[PDB]
Amino acid sequence: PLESQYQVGPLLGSGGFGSVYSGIRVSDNLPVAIKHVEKDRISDWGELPNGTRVPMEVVLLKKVSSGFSGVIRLLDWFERPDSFVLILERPEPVQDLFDFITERGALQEELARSFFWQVLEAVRHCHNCGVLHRDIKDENILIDLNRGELKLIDFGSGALLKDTVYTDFDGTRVYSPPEWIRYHRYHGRSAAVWSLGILLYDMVCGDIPFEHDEEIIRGQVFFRQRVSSECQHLIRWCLALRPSDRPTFEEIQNHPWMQDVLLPQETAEIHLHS
Numbered sequence: 001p002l003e004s005q006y007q008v009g010p011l012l013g014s015g016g017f018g019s020v021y022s023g024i025r026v027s028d029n030l031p032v033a034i035k036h037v038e039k040d041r042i043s044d045w046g047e048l049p050n051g052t053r054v055p056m057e058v059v060l061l062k063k064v065s066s067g068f069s070g071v072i073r074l075l076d077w078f079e080r081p082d083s084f085v086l087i088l089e090r091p092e093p094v095q096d097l098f099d100f101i102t103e104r105g106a107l108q109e110e111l112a113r114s115f116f117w118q119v120l121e122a123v124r125h126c127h128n129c130g131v132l133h134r135d136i137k138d139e140n141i142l143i144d145l146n147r148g149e150l151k152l153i154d155f156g157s158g159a160l161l162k163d164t165v166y167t168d169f170d171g172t173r174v175y176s177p178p179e180w181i182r183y184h185r186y187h188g189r190s191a192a193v194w195s196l197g198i199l200l201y202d203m204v205c206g207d208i209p210f211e212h213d214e215e216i217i218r219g220q221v222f223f224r225q226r227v228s229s230e231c232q233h234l235i236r237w238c239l240a241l242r243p244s245d246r247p248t249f250e251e252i253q254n255h256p257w258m259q260d261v262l263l264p265q266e267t268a269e270i271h272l273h274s
């Protein structure tokens with residue numbers, strides 16, 4: 001075939017590992033996103049079930065692909081001499097959570113509850129498929145505005161999920177746990193939960209709680225916005241200094257603050273004016 005099975009549009013984002021463009025599949029007009037990653041900027045390399053040297057991002061995306069809309073679907077991929085090109089599904093209209101929060105400010109709790117629940121469902125899907133995202137954050141979450149459905153993207157910092165200790169990290173620092181900062185060691189699940197705590201704080205406060213290593217290590221959370229005691233409790237639990245003190249995914253979803261979540265479509269009708 002050859003890459004030109006697609007019509008390239010505007011640049012949607014860069015600055016992380018790749019440059020992502022809006023595109024359209026010529027065959028059926030399907031909207032897609034075209035992500036380019038330079039071979040020299042790829043942190044971890046992996047190999048495909050059939051024996052081929054490809055970026056870990058392709059390995060992980062293949063492992064999570066399925067009918068579940070919570071994670072972006074990899075449609076196809078290509079290798080060039082100096083890069084890899086990934087063809088991803090693209091919702092329309094769409095907006096990433098960083099832009100959404102930047103534009104709208106702190107989210108009402110009902111909206112944050114729906115968004116956060118969906119992220120949880122998506123991360124649980126990843127882990128059940130043997131994949132650890134390692135870069136959960138606003139920029140890496142897409143909002144399908146008409147459907148009220150959130151989608152996780154950017155597996156460029158990810159890894160295969162394991163139960164032993166990780167001594168490597170290339171995700172976002174200010175989303176990284178204190179055990180990483182101090183000892184360069186963490187376990188996947190508890191680190192994911194720390195990042196979820198940063199994410200939830202960001203949603204209900206409009207910004208992240210910590211900027212410097214010192215603040216991460218201290219782990220003291222201050223609320224600048226009016227946030228319910230149940231939400232505050234959940235956030236502070238996710239941000240426990242000792243990893244074993246953090247809640248499992250099940251405890252998060254069983255937390256009182258998470259009860260009575262809106263359906264995605266309900267969410268869009270009320271908060272995204274469908």
Ligand SMILES: Nc1ncnc2c1ncn2[C@@H]1O[C@H](COP(=O)(O)OP(=O)(O)NP(=O)(O)O)[C@@H](O)[C@H]1O
Pocket residue numbers: 012013014015016017018019020032033035072088089090091094096135139140142153154155156
């Ligand atoms: N499938 C998609 N559909 C629509 N927009 C996308 C899609 N993939 C990525 N984007 C946008 O492009 C940006 C960069 O995509 P991403 O896969 O995150 O690459 P990255 O530049 O390497 N860093 P990051 O934002 O930390 O993942 C995002 O923040 C999204 O705004």
